[PDB]
Amino acid sequence: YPQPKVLTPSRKDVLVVTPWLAPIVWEGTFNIDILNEQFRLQNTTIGLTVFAIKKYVAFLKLFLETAEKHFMVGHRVHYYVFTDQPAAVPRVTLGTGRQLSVLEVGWQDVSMRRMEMISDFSERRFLSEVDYLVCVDVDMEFRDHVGVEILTPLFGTLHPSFYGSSREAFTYERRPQSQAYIPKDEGDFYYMGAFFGGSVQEVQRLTRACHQAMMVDQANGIEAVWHDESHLNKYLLRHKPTKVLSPEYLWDQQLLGWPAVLRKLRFTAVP
Amino acid sequence: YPQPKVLTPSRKDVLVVTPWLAPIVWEGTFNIDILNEQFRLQNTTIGLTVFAIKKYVAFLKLFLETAEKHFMVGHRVHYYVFTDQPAAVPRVTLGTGRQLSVLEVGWQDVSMRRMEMISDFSERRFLSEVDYLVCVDVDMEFRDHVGVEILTPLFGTLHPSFYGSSREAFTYERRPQSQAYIPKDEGDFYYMGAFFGGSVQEVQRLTRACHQAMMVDQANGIEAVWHDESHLNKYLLRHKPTKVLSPEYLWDQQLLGWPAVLRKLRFTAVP
């Protein structure tokens, strides 16, 4: 491998470590050959959850085809597709060591569905073999490597509309009557609900907390401004992630182009 | 706290994350108030081990006085002083939540003593309450903050003579007959034996491995070039640390001055 050089920053343009010493994952910050060896030595298994409800089942074919090209290639992967149309999941051929299961799903209860269902699912014993869970939205495609550099006990992803913004511009929940409330003077980053994950335990804990917090808000007649994302951000403020993914990992090229600071566009919105 | 800004590097002059995404700890990379809160919430206890043998017992008074000013202030600390002169340990008054124990010690077996004794010690049940062990040399003084930013499952410290050097200049053990052997083309950094640590488990594992490797070398009539440091470096090459401390943490101002890249000189040689 090329020797790291102590007197040469890996990036001169971006913050690559948070103030609580969690890596912010950008191209140029990691040697994937080292990371792949470390994770393969542990026989790492990654579960990928994705919800595809009503017309959004149409997005599963490109999402899965492109996951097979770019997501955790060479590691053990299990896809868990949550859908109300289990018979409509496309038959995509998978590489060795990779499996897919379909979990059938049965307005505020639809708002709670994602955290409720990931919470119930994440506690099942059929996950005993799975080491990390990654939770993403379906109306996306992979365009470049998304691999074991993201894995850690708890991660969030910088929202691509906000990574350049000050915190008062962040769209946190600002009513103190909501469990998701964040005061004006608080907050590290604005994380997006479309891509988070961690170890199975840390994802049990995040989704239980978000689900329980939303049920309290429902009981009180309150819907947070950005729904489970608002709760995700209150959670990650109090329980800080151990890696943060850069917007390479969650981007919309039609809306935001391809700025110089993004050396790769890895996981993008489908236009 | 001041908002981290994604488009502003924390340092423009130094590498702050290794290629396996371990933070390299420099001033400017961490907000100590966040870290202190995270560690205090876990009631973190840090054990500090130090050997002071023969004439080196003279260095304990300034080492302890200055540890009390700068080492893990506000956290639970237990000092374990290994010495052949247990009656010569100075009576230094300690802050609340901090305790000191004296462990009496009884040429190649002196070379193995540090890893042998840390290994036996690290497995004792009187460490049940201790979360991290930090292992340093005694002929030093603290001059500035050394705190919970260093704590992680496994850490090493960049040797201050080598942080600017290419790997072929590193003084690894280069005879393939030694358990410490590192080939010319391998190596990430040169770590110093004077400051390493981690969680109690990871320090059990590092010191057991180094001790067992040195016993094999002794059986074969081989002493590695830099003794247990050579073994430390073979270990940290194969089991990569989860933080690396910058030379702020281990410096000699008489030999090396105070370069601009060191914003603080935290733990230094006594001239």
Number of Cβ atoms within 10 Å of the Cβ of B76? 19
A37 vs B: CB within 8 A: no
Which of A13, A149, A187 faces B21 most closely, judged by CB atoms? A149
Query: Are the CB atoms for B156 and B240 separated by under 8 Å?
Result: no
- What residues contact A43, with CB distance under 8 A and at least 6 apart? A76
Q: Name chain A contacts of B246, Cβ cutoff 8 Å.
A: 6
Cβ atoms of A235 and A209 closer than 8 Å: yes
Burial A92-129, CB ≥16 within 10 A → b, else e = beeeeebebebeebeeeeebbbbbbbbbebbeeeebee
Give the largest CA-CA distance in chain B.
Answer: 57
- What six digits make up the tokens of B223? 């002493």
Q: How far apart are CA A104 and CA A81, in angstroms?
A: 8
Question: N- to C-terminal Cα distance for chain B?
Answer: 38
Amino acid at site B119: S
SS3 B64: helix
Class of A1-271 in CATH: alpha beta
Cross-chain residue pair B15–A30, CB shorter than 8 Å: no
Contact with chain B for residue A42, Cβ under 8 A:
no
Q: Count CA atoms closer than 13 A to A21's CA, side-chain side.
A: 25
Residue A159, amino acid: H
**What is the rounded distance in angstroms from the CA atom of residue A207 to the CA atom of residue A198?**
11
| CB distance B158 to B193 below 8 Å | no
SS3 B101: strand
Alpha helices in chain A (DSSP H): 32-41, 60-70, 108-122, 200-219, 228-238, 253-256
Residue A120, helix vs strand vs coil: helix
Resolution in A: 1.5
Name the maximum alpha-carbon separation found in chain A: 57
Q: How far A54 CA lies from chain B's nearest CA (Å)?
A: 37
**Residues on chain A touching B38 (C-beta within 8 angstroms):** 20, 240
- Angle, vertex CA B38, rays to CA B32 and CA B42, nearest 5: 135
Nearest CA in chain B to A244: B6
Q: Which of A73, A82, A70, A76 is nearest to A46 (CA)?
A: A76
B122, containing H or E segment: helix B108-122
Q: Please check whether residue B213 is in contact with residue B158, taking contact to mean a CB–CB distance below 8 angstroms.
A: no
> Is B228 labelled as part of a ligand binding site?
no
Contacts of B243 in chain A (CB under 8 A): 21
- Is the minimum CB–CB distance between B162 and chain A shorter than 8 Å? no
> Does B173 count as an annotated binding residue?
no
| Cα-based distances in Å from B178 to B115, B195, B220 | 17, 23, 8
Picking from A57, A206, A75, the residue whose alpha carbon sits closest to that of residue A146 is A75
Side-chain-side CA neighbours of B258 within 13 Å: the count stands at: 7
